[PDB]
Amino acid sequence: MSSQAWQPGVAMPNLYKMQRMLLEKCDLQNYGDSATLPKGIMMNVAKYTQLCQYLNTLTLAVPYNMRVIHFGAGSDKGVAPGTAVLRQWLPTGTLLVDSDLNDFVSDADSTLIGDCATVHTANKWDLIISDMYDPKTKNVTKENDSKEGFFTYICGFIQQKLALGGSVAIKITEHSWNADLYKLMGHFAWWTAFVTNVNASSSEAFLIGCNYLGKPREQIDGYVMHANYIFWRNTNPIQLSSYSLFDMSKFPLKLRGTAVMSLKEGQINDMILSLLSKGRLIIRENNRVVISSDVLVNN
């Protein structure tokens, strides 16, 4: 019905990001409703498809031999639907690694099983996707404070292992959020909170940071920004829609061939920071991709 029902989802408008709201409870109008999925399509396939459809509109850096890591890729079904959508979306030959606490079968090039804090990589990454979520986090009886857990790992992983010019998409909800992650969005050339039209009845969103700069371009109070996000969701009902799932002719991520360079910190200048902000440069080593998971040994 509404004009955005034909879009893959809705991004948080800029004016809501500039407010100073206090944190309120999230009360969605269309809460409890569900979108009508195409026959036989899982919710997570539809959700990831609309996420990738929206990422197609941004200035993602897409180099040759791209490296993507996907946290929280397992489901209670033992398979990885989000990884399958990512592998369809990403160019052929893209190295895709996924991980989850519980065992699962996936189409990724390599899979690590265990808590994300046990995951270590020698190389940097061009794109980080996280669907990590703890269902015990939704507790409406207690105060809604900033959460640690895997969010503490994700913040450190981005600052250490995300290449300059890379991007992220981290799943959050009303209660599953972290103030430092919002603050880290100010280290990208651009950021938003994206709600898929297929899951618009949920407080879930994907925090998207576009083109990592490795330095704060803008100072963001994480506690205030999450309150701004909830205020947007509370006052902007989003109509559930699966319309964008029916047109996949333009789905694959475009082969841009973004240049990869290995640079020292001092070499970064405004001209290169401009190339990073436009998605026309990735800064990282081009060595081999090596990963590992720490194993605690006990009786």
Place this chain on the structure above:
Amino acid sequence: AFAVDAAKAYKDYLASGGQPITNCVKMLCTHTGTGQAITVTPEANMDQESFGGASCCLYCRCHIDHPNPKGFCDLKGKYVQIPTTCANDPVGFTLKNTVCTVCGMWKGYGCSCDQ
């Protein structure tokens, strides 16, 4: 000399009225693809559905070794095209059918080499 044979066990389980393996990951696509059996991206035509390969492999789903030296999997990391009439049991279809080495279509479901 002993080796577990899950392929025959799944065929017998299906013949005795067992419910097929579920939660195979079906993909969204244009359904205007080449129609080949196993591809790097979804290639279903109007008569097919495209699935994530690993979710349609009996040996992947059952957490058992693949029946060949090196233990290599044909489907993991790729996408398998299943005829829509058989999309209710993708694991059974990939088990029972074979891909033509010439054209890449399912033998009996697209391959027209011996016609």
